[PDB]
Design a protein around this motif. Structure first.
Motif, PDB file in Angstrom:
ATOM      1  N   UNK A 128     -36.309  34.422 -61.982  1.00  0.00           N
ATOM      2  CA  UNK A 128     -36.054  33.097 -60.900  1.00  0.00           C
ATOM      3  C   UNK A 128     -37.269  32.584 -60.742  1.00  0.00           C
ATOM      4  N   UNK A 129     -37.298  31.410 -60.564  1.00  0.00           N
ATOM      5  CA  UNK A 129     -38.611  30.702 -60.050  1.00  0.00           C
ATOM      6  C   UNK A 129     -38.806  30.461 -58.618  1.00  0.00           C
ATOM      7  N   UNK A 130     -39.743  31.248 -58.100  1.00  0.00           N
ATOM      8  CA  UNK A 130     -39.952  31.309 -56.788  1.00  0.00           C
ATOM      9  C   UNK A 130     -40.161  29.902 -56.013  1.00  0.00           C
ATOM     10  N   UNK A 131     -40.488  29.109 -56.775  1.00  0.00           N
ATOM     11  CA  UNK A 131     -40.798  27.894 -56.476  1.00  0.00           C
ATOM     12  C   UNK A 131     -39.636  26.724 -56.617  1.00  0.00           C
ATOM     13  N   UNK A 132     -38.292  27.367 -56.889  1.00  0.00           N
ATOM     14  CA  UNK A 132     -37.252  26.548 -56.971  1.00  0.00           C
ATOM     15  C   UNK A 132     -37.021  25.595 -55.639  1.00  0.00           C
ATOM     16  N   UNK A 133     -36.307  24.249 -55.748  1.00  0.00           N
ATOM     17  CA  UNK A 133     -36.391  23.782 -54.726  1.00  0.00           C
ATOM     18  C   UNK A 133     -34.572  23.315 -54.608  1.00  0.00           C
ATOM     19  N   UNK A 134     -34.360  22.893 -53.646  1.00  0.00           N
ATOM     20  CA  UNK A 134     -32.908  22.302 -53.440  1.00  0.00           C
ATOM     21  C   UNK A 134     -33.070  20.809 -53.370  1.00  0.00           C
ATOM     22  N   UNK A 135     -32.074  20.052 -53.110  1.00  0.00           N
ATOM     23  CA  UNK A 135     -32.102  18.724 -53.122  1.00  0.00           C
ATOM     24  C   UNK A 135     -32.944  18.212 -51.768  1.00  0.00           C
ATOM     25  N   UNK A 136     -32.985  19.047 -50.925  1.00  0.00           N
ATOM     26  CA  UNK A 136     -34.002  18.490 -49.765  1.00  0.00           C
ATOM     27  C   UNK A 136     -35.546  18.801 -49.702  1.00  0.00           C
ATOM     28  N   UNK A 137     -35.888  19.564 -51.128  1.00  0.00           N
ATOM     29  CA  UNK A 137     -37.098  19.920 -51.145  1.00  0.00           C
ATOM     30  C   UNK A 137     -37.558  21.285 -50.578  1.00  0.00           C
TER      31      UNK A 137
END
Ligand SMILES: [Ca+2]
Ligand SMILES: [Cl-]
Length: 157
Positions: A27-36
């Motif tokens: 998993x990418x620890x820098x993943x973001x949701x639609x709110x950043x």
């Protein structure tokens, strides 16, 4: 399977063991949701100290902005999460990062009124005279709010 979305949810929810499995699966620890928001934002928001620590040592971006311009340190300040503030400062947070209204963590902690966090920020490099987009320093905020104990601390030479 979207590992980043699961990691965001596990970080918010305090699910330490699932956070570890997701990272182990890439998993990418820098993943973001639609709110950043990133996992570090959400773990900081919820006061999940051990998840914050794990994300940091995995290399998570410490100064990434969400859609409001907030870094994880802004969030730790806004809500007054002392131990989170301290660990972010030890691990590369930019103490004077600005959000989209020009506020630094100090402005946010000052508006909250959290004396101890204000002093932690100051004594870890916060610019006492940083101004937000409407010209306010942390001192101006403390005056505006009537917090004289804070105003004293901020004006101490
Ligand atoms: Ca110092
Ligand atoms: Cl594990």
């Amino acid at each position: 399977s979207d590992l980043g979305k699961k990691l965001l949810e596990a970080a918010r929810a305090g699910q330490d063991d699932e956070v570890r499995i997701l990272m182990a699966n890439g998993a990418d620890v820098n993943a973001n949701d639609e709110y950043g928001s990133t996992p570090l934002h959400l773990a900081a928001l919820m006061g999940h100290l051990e998840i914050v620590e794990v994300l940091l040592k995995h290399g998570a971006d410490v100064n990434a902005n969400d859609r409001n311009g907030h870094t994880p340190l802004h969030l730790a300040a806004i809500y007054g999460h002392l131990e989170i503030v301290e660990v972010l400062l030890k691990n590369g947070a930019d103490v004077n990062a600005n959000d989209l209204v020009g506020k630094t963590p100090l402005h946010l902690a000052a508006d909250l009124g959290h004396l101890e966090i204000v002093e932690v920020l100051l004594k870890n490099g916060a610019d006492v005279n940083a101004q937000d987009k409407f010209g306010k320093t942390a001192f101006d905020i403390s005056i505006d709010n009537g917090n004289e104990d804070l105003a004293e601390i901020l004006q101490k030479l």
